[PDB]
Amino acid sequence: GASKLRAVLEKLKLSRDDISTAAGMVKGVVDHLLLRLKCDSAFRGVGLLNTGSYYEHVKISAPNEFDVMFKLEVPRIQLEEYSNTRAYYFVKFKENPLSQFLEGEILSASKMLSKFRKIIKEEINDTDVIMKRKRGGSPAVTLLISEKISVDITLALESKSSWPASTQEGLRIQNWLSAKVRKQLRLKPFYLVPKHAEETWRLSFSHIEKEILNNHGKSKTCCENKEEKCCRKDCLKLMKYLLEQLKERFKDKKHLDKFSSYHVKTAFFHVCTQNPQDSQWDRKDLGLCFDNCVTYFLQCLRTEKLENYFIPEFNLFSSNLIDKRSKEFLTKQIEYERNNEFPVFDE
């Protein structure tokens, strides 16, 4: 029931101070690294993009892990869609700081990532910060702070052009946040992160995700007063915690390894579109609202369909990305939990 769910939310608050303190340590290192990348020629125009769960106020665990995005203003970008992926692109240009990374027409993510890593390792050595390494094109590089906090740093090109055609039917917020807001948001830049699908880049809208979370009501004053305290953020925190707790019960074989907080977040945005009124997220209806989120996530698993919220034809749950057996496995676990009032949350 809602009492059990409220107890979960109270438990998550116990970790708030550890996360904030660690976030401050990350900021100290990031600020130091950023001011020295301004010295390196290739990345002089780098800037901090304050995206990610901490800045969305929904980081509820893992105080030793942070995702940080650096942006790099890149004038005059023309994109070329890679195959028919809708989310992956080659970067071209209509001097140029990134001129040294061009192979013919195409901007090489491999060459640019290589310099980025090398330049960061050079600046890092010049206090108790070093560079770890993991799997994936983005994050580009990883810092280890005080031999304790791991910061995944993503480099993202910033394009101040209009969003790609593949986003034309995405961001379906008109009945919730308004058509006015949708137009305003689409005048904002978009980002490209280096990401294998080759020298491909993937669209990123983490800045818009943060805006939609921190200004999330139909009412402009949602969550600015006691009469309009909704449970949207609480529901996202509970969905994230549900997935984290289920993953913890398979640390051995990591059967749920393919599922991520980003899947949860994407599904949550879809539920906001489906339930656009603030009265559909009343604080007193926490249990029902959480049920709405869990049942939609279940539907995504069973139908093997979870559309990227900005790029509808990019299906995060296609069997190409996540095998059917893994989705059926998570379906069985979540179904059991839901039908039993979430014993995973029992104390």
Instruction: Kindly list the residues in this chain that would bind Zn ion in the complex (CB under 5 A).
Output: 217, 222-223, 230
Cβ of residue 279: shortest distance to Zn ion, in angstroms?
A: 11
Instruction: Supply φ then ψ for residue 209, to 5 degrees.
Output: -60, -40
CB of 208 to Zn ion, least distance (A): 18
Residue 235 annotated as binding? no
Any known ligand binding at 209? yes
- Toward Zn ion, which CB reaches closer, 92 or 283? 283
C-beta of 153 vs 239, nearer to Zn ion: 239
Closer CB to Zn ion, 149 or 223, in the complex: 223
Distance CA 68, CA 54 (A): 10
DSSP 117-179: HHHHHHHHH---EEEE--S-SSS-EEEEETTTEEEEEEEEEEE-SPPPGGGTT----TTTT-H
Nearest distance from C-beta of residue 275 to Zn ion, angstroms: 12
**Closest approach of Zn ion to the CB of residue 229, in Å:** 7
Q: What kind and span of H or E run contains 68?
A: strand 65-73
**Is residue 134 annotated as involved in ligand binding?**
no
Q: Which is nearer to Zn ion, 108 or 280 (CB)?
A: 280
Closer of 140 and 271 to Zn ion (Cβ): 271
> Please, what is the minimum distance in Å from the beta carbon of residue 188 to Zn ion?
22
Task: Please state whether beta strands 77-81 and 190-194 pair in parallel, antiparallel, or not at all (unpaired).
Answer: unpaired
> What number of other Cβ atoms are within 10 A of residue 19's Cβ?
19
Known binding residue 261? Answer is: yes
Is 264 labelled as part of a ligand binding site? yes
- Give residues with Cβ within 8 angstroms of 184, minimum separation 6: none
Pick out the residues of the known binding site for 2',3'-cGAMP: 67, 152, 195, 202
Pick out the residues of the known binding site for Mg(2+): 65, 67, 152
Pick out the residues of the known binding site: 51, 53, 65-67, 152, 195, 202-209, 216, 222-223, 230, 240, 261-265
Pick out the residues of the known binding site for Zn(2+): 216, 222-223, 230
